């Protein structure tokens, strides 16, 4: 199957973040689009946090058949 370890929705969050590359104001510009300075590493990285927050919002109800919905009868 499908693993989401970044995929394409990781990928260009992180590059558009990425892309500011140290520059905080322009991080701070770009966290709108879920792009935090992190003082760790000191560039602006993704928001891992809003990105697992955003996709377990993406389940739509819960009913997500990534094999089989239901047997029913």
Do not use: P
Not at 2 to 30: V, Y
Not at 56 to 63: L, N, R, W
Request: net charge positive; hydrophobic share 15%.
């Amino acid at each position: 199957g499908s693993k989401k370890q970044q995929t394409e929705s990781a990928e260009n969050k992180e590059k558009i973040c990425n892309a500011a590359k140290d520059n905080q104001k322009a991080c701070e510009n770009l966290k709108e689009k879920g792009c935090v300075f992190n003082t760790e590493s000191n560039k602006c990285e993704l928001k891992k946090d809003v990105k697992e927050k955003l996709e377990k919002e993406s389940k739509e109800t819960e009913g997500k058949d990534e094999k089989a919905n239901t047997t029913g009868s």
